[PDB]
Amino acid sequence: ISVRGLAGVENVTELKKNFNRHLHFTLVKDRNVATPRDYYFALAHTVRDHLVGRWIRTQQHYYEKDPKRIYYLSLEFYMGRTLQNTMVNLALENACDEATYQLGLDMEELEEIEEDAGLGNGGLGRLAACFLDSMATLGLAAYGYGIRYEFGIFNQKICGGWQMEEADDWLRYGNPWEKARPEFTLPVHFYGRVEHTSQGAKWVDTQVVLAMPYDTPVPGYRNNVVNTMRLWSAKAPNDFNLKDFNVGGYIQAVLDRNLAENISRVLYPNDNFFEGKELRLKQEYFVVAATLQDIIRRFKSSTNFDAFPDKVAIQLNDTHPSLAIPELMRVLVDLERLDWDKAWEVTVKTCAYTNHTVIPEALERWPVHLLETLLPRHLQIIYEINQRFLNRVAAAFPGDVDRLRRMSLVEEGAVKRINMAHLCIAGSHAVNGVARIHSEILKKTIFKDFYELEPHKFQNKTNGITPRRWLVLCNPGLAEIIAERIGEEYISDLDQLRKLLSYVDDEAFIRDVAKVKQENKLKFAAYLEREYKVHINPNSLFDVQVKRIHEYKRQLLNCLHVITLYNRIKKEPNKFVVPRTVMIGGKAAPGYHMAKMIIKLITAIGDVVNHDPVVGDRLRVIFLENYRVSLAEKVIPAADLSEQISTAGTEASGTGNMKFMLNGALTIGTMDGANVEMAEEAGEENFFIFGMRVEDVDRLDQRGYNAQEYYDRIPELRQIIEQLSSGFFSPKQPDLFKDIVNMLMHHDRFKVFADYEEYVKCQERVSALYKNPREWTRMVIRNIATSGKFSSDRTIAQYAREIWGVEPSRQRLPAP
Amino acid sequence: ISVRGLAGVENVTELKKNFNRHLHFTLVKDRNVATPRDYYFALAHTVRDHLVGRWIRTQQHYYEKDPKRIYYLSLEFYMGRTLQNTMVNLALENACDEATYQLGLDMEELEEIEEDAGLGNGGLGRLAACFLDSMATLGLAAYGYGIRYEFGIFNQKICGGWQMEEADDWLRYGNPWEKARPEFTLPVHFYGRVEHTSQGAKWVDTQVVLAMPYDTPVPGYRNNVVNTMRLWSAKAPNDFNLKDFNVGGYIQAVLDRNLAENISRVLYPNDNFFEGKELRLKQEYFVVAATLQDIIRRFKSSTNFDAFPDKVAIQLNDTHPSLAIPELMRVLVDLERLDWDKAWEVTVKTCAYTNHTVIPEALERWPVHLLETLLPRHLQIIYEINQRFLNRVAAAFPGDVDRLRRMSLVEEGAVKRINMAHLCIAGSHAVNGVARIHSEILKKTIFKDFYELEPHKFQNKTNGITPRRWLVLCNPGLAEIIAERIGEEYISDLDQLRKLLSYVDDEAFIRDVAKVKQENKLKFAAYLEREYKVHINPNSLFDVQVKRIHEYKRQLLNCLHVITLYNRIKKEPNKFVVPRTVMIGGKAAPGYHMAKMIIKLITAIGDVVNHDPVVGDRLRVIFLENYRVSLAEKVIPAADLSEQISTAGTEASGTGNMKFMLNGALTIGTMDGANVEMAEEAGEENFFIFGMRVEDVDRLDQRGYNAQEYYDRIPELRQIIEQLSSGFFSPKQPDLFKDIVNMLMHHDRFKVFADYEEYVKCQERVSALYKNPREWTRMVIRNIATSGKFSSDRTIAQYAREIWGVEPSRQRLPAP
Numbered sequence A, B: 001i002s003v004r005g006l007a008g009v010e011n012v013t014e015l016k017k018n019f020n021r022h023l024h025f026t027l028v029k030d031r032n033v034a035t036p037r038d039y040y041f042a043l044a045h046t047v048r049d050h051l052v053g054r055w056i057r058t059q060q061h062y063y064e065k066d067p068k069r070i071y072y073l074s075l076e077f078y079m080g081r082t083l084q085n086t087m088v089n090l091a092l093e094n095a096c097d098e099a100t101y102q103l104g105l106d107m108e109e110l111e112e113i114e115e116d117a118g119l120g121n122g123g124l125g126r127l128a129a130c131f132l133d134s135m136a137t138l139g140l141a142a143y144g145y146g147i148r149y150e151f152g153i154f155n156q157k158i159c160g161g162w163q164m165e166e167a168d169d170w171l172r173y174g175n176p177w178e179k180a181r182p183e184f185t186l187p188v189h190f191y192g193r194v195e196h197t198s199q200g201a202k203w204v205d206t207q208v209v210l211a212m213p214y215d216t217p218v219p220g221y222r223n224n225v226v227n228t229m230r231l232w233s234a235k236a237p238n239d240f241n242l243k244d245f246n247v248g249g250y251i252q253a254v255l256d257r258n259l260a261e262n263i264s265r266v267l268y269p270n271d272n273f274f275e276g277k278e279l280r281l282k283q284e285y286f287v288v289a290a291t292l293q294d295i296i297r298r299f300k301s302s303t304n305f306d307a308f309p310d311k312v313a314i315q316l317n318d319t320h321p322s323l324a325i326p327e328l329m330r331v332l333v334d335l336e337r338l339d340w341d342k343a344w345e346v347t348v349k350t351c352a353y354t355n356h357t358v359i360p361e362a363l364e365r366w367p368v369h370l371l372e373t374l375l376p377r378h379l380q381i382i383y384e385i386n387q388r389f390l391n392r393v394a395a396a397f398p399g400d401v402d403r404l405r406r407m408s409l410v411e412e413g414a415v416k417r418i419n420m421a422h423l424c425i426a427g428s429h430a431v432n433g434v435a436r437i438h439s440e441i442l443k444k445t446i447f448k449d450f451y452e453l454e455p456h457k458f459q460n461k462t463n464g465i466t467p468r469r470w471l472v473l474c475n476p477g478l479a480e481i482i483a484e485r486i487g488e489e490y491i492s493d494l495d496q497l498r499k500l501l502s503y504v505d506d507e508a509f510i511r512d513v514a515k516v517k518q519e520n521k522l523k524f525a526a527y528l529e530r531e532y533k534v535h536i537n538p539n540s541l542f543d544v545q546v547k548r549i550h551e552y553k554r555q556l557l558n559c560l561h562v563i564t565l566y567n568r569i570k571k572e573p574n575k576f577v578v579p580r581t582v583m584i585g586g587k588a589a590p591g592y593h594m595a596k597m598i599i600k601l602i603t604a605i606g607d608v609v610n611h612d613p614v615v616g617d618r619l620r621v622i623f624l625e626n627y628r629v630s631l632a633e634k635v636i637p638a639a640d641l642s643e644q645i646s647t648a649g650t651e652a653s654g655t656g657n658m659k660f661m662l663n664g665a666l667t668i669g670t671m672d673g674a675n676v677e678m679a680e681e682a683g684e685e686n687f688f689i690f691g692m693r694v695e696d697v698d699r700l701d702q703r704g705y706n707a708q709e710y711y712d713r714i715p716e717l718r719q720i721i722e723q724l725s726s727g728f729f730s731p732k733q734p735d736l737f738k739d740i741v742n743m744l745m746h747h748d749r750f751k752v753f754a755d756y757e758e759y760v761k762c763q764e765r766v767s768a769l770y771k772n773p774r775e776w777t778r779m780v781i782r783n784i785a786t787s788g789k790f791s792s793d794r795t796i797a798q799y800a801r802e803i804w805g806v807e808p809s810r811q812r813l814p815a816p
């Protein structure tokens, strides 16, 4: 079998008895009545057993050596399943495969039983998960801090072509990976008021909610390092949430506890969109308040807080955990009694902020009346921070009164708001973008004034993905043939993939690379009929666009191309065209009307196209249901063409693009986010770039975007729009897509029409190349061999050195 | 050490490594950071490991042999801690004691860490728990069915002498004894409406709530039998509780799931009192609906339901699970399509009902509009049952029109109600009382008309307690000296205690019995200062009354005696009186104003009495906080005098009385409930009986109870009442106890004054005997040696033979 580890005689035997120990003592079942779910748990407990020994010594190790600790705060950690990933990082995969085989079970069948830990929306949360893996693999004393939602991202269902949302009760049957830690439970305060006494302000009459931590192990890749991801759960105190007496009802008081505990109940399903709800703000303060107490308690052990920044680094994944800044000041000033200036120096030195987007609707601007009621003391601290900061600005730019209001953390107008992004820049010693072009846009546009004030704060850290889950785990076949030629060191040193460049003309390698992709497509095509049912052709080109549904991602632009292909076939039926299976998948936030309308359009197109006899098997339009991490692990390795077509300047970085490049797909996209660095790495000749560059978009905005012009000059485009308008795709409801057509024609913020012509022209070129298997595969080799820069191990090493001030190490911890 | 088992060489070694296995792999801790709570869990998992092997074979056994199954339905199971009880029934106590000792830990200290499973209010719920233990010990294929409340009976706190209630979050840190079983999850329906079609009625448009079962092991005493207690948890479906579309909010829909799940959130804290709230009715149907589906599924395996009653017996613990009758009919008739009459014959033959009280306010009378809305089909079935039953009555008593309305299940008046007790009698083949006198009262009074209609249904089954938890567990010292003389067979054959009668004159035994009681009192006196702090004298007579606070239990009568003792001391300070420490403990339902006023009176008396220098150590009044099962295990073995002073005819049976008799306390009480059979068993000369008999109470009611008469003729009583009235016990609030005085004088339903004189006269006699250690101990021996009849093994054997139709067996199951 492959390089999924050794299947040692002693270890396969040991594994089997432990599997049986758990099936008996843990699941209290006997072979006779054991369900595949029982078997999955017996294995999970058996595999988990192998890392507790290492988990304990890693933590004990950091206590003894006492290195600088890295705290990654995020309201999202899109982890996915954890059984296989643990086997991989522990080199247990083959031994486990063999052992379950001897026990007469199919390991792959059991793996499918594990529920995804979908505590994330998309890119932002998956990054945090890839980062955790890399920090462990690079031997960093890092902790992931977040919220333990009992309901993660909703499960998407398609009814009559429409998306239906349903609760993701991922804890229903239990989580074998987490470990509750009821000794470090902590109190978090809300509401109350501020009393200004003689020796300081006091936050008084607050409502208390407890934060209970749950630890999940994060194993490094084959180095015996197991870090921790600590997730907080909300718990109501038993006293006041019952003890605030004088009528109301005892029963009611108890039932009302589910009011303080609602804080960790569900994840907000918004991707790149801000919703100013109180529950969201509560979650944000909750994770911040509890995490900081835990961070300081650990430090107090390790009171001059001058050394605090030398032992602590806290990274802010977006502005979601931005209250960490005024909260750190509160504790230092109100509780520890440090002077403002010393406190601020410490705060700025330990905090760092990462920006993930530039769209305005994604920006966090919290109404002042909300902060005023829920966190009175924090609002005071924010005003004081703002006051001193603006004084700095005035001193630097004398008389520049407009600059002052532009830079304020407080925004005036309808209702006063607090710009959380301005708060983060002011209280952090480093601010970074997630891709070179996004980082430049931050300096030139959005945060230009701040860059002029303190240029040294702004940096770039291009995103990356973990080659463990995103290669070895999901594509063992590709990982194996690569290993046959260059060894296994590349798994933790992706740059070595470049060595594959010298096999670009190797006849055996070209055949192998092409064979694994074929086996991957056949397996996906099978899975499709198995779990979703209705056939596809594995010989066609697999055209896939999978990511959250957004107007800026332009799934709509993809739709226009699909309809074009269809119309051309209907025009010249007996003309040869390269067969394609275009798959589009992704979730739409529940309140995002337009995004939900786009899902219906995709399914509507499929209804027409998939049942037209003249089309035959030359074109199928499929909507991939419930796109999530586990589903991504299946489609990506099977894709031929990766769609990354966002309007230039809107996708900060993207990471799915990197996943496809590493797995043998060719990319068709715009010069946006990381797409630029990828084409720069592979060579533009090995990439399918099209459309407007950032500057063309700006030129168009100066002159003014008029979709009618495009509609007027392109007959094919006009024909499509008139098809949608007349009900060609919605017979029973002819005006069903009027909102889409209306928007495309009059309020398209992302100029879909502007890139239409260059997009279908470019798609013609990919079809031309696909007709030449050998050359397509050779270009594929050029992409894979050149994807090494996009490993999160490179990203993390850069954060470590340029922001945290710590040195990565690939040293194996002293055995388990 | 005692007879807590053998401390085998191989087993103490095995125990230790398993303790360490769990501390490492299960608790993921290392000796260095392990908290006593971690140690408690390591041990709990180690002990639990020893019964899973037996649990599996016991269940497998019942499947193979297929005996008649006994289903005990109760909304209450007052279990208490389970670590020690499991050790005892498995004969692991010494081995575990030795092993933890070698590991350098104190087993007793770890035991105190376990949280009580307080899923009961008092007598009714503790009975169910004693019964479960006995059914396992007698080798019966029995299952306990109930609700898994996440919050059991509230924890009682005394603030300023007042009771404060606080949420009992007993699952906070986890339950090592239960095992979730997510494969047998079941749907339960609510609301909806009834469609009458062509071939039957249909319950339609219902709201669905899921019932998830959790199994807890119930080990028999040293026979390798481990039965199951299955507790249901409410879970919201992920669909409709989200899928019923058309605006409302996605977040809100998810947060609203805690509406269907509130059904199993908290136990109603009412003891012998009915509260017609909808949530209560929902809990009642919930446990019934889920249990029945599970019972029928098991039977379908084992479709002629003629054999149903031959394989199934379901016992109703009070009327709480009474909906099992119309629910069984619904399934049989609506779903299985059996004719009414065949269905009714089956239902009556499998159901049996146990009555626990005769007070009217405890009787369940559900408003028809409530049943009409929540369970429309069940109301129809109840009307049909009533119709046919009354027809039976009319046929038997022609022209007796008043008898007809008296017997109806439907009560007319203000609002129509359904008398659940009448429902149970009609649909059950057996109805029993819980003590001989209570059973006679049922036939003569409350259910007289029903008895005349079907005399064969009415039986008696005097309650009992388990000698395992209520002797061996809580009083090993007494269990040991008994064993030294008559052996160990009495633990599962309590009648053998009679053999102790021949040692009544044994000088060594008298000294031993007296010594263990002294050691018990010293340990309790210590525990008092340890956890509650404020000294007591262990040489005094321990006068204790512990049970729920109720007007019928007459804690108030106890209070009058205490005040009398105090007043007499103040009158003749230098006169000798037998020292006493009177302890009163118990919880009051949160809405029970009078009961809460009584707790304040007790603490108020203590405030005066405990600080009067003239009194010295001759009299202390102590209120035992948070009385529960674990606290009962401590006080009872230390008590000298047991107070069972309810008004004759009000306490159905009582069980605390039996606990005290078995543990060396003498009893002062009225001829009520089981007190009558206890004095009859021990000989009235060895009991301190006083007050009115049932007949005297009735004579008084005919003539009319006038408390003033007593107040007028007894100066001591008058003096007490004037002390309460003038604020002698409440200086700052002189009229604080006006409600108590007002009630005592004008609306005393339980004639406290009527038994006052005979009560203090009798108390004088117990003090006289206490002055003679040797004779007190000899009388104590007469009680213990004669308590064997009160074992739940005797009660269960009777239920088995006279109601269920099964034969008990003390046969050891074929090893683990």
Ligand SMILES: O=C(O)CCCCCCOc1c(Cl)cc(NC(=O)NC(=O)c2ccccc2Cl)cc1Cl
Binding pocket: A027, A028, A029, A030, A031, A032, A033, A034, B055, B056, B059, B060, B061, B063, B064, B179, B215
């Ligand atoms: O194995 C097959 O291939 C199916 C054989 C079906 C024929 C009857 C088998 O007899 C059995 C056997 Cl072998 C085992 C069991 N039961 C538990 O293992 N386990 C439990 O019941 C159990 C499960 C969880 C928690 C507590 C318990 Cl006690 C119950 C019965 Cl009835």
Ligand SMILES: O=C(O)CCCCCCOc1c(Cl)cc(NC(=O)NC(=O)c2ccccc2Cl)cc1Cl
Binding pocket: A055, A056, A059, A060, A061, A063, A064, A179, A215, B027, B028, B029, B030, B031, B032, B033, B034
């Ligand atoms: O034992 C004493 O007497 C106290 C000794 C204090 C001095 C430092 C000891 O060094 C240690 C040692 Cl020995 C052990 C640990 N940690 C775990 O065992 N266990 C965990 O951290 C742990 C606990 C639950 C779930 C997951 C983990 Cl990783 C952590 C550290 Cl820092």
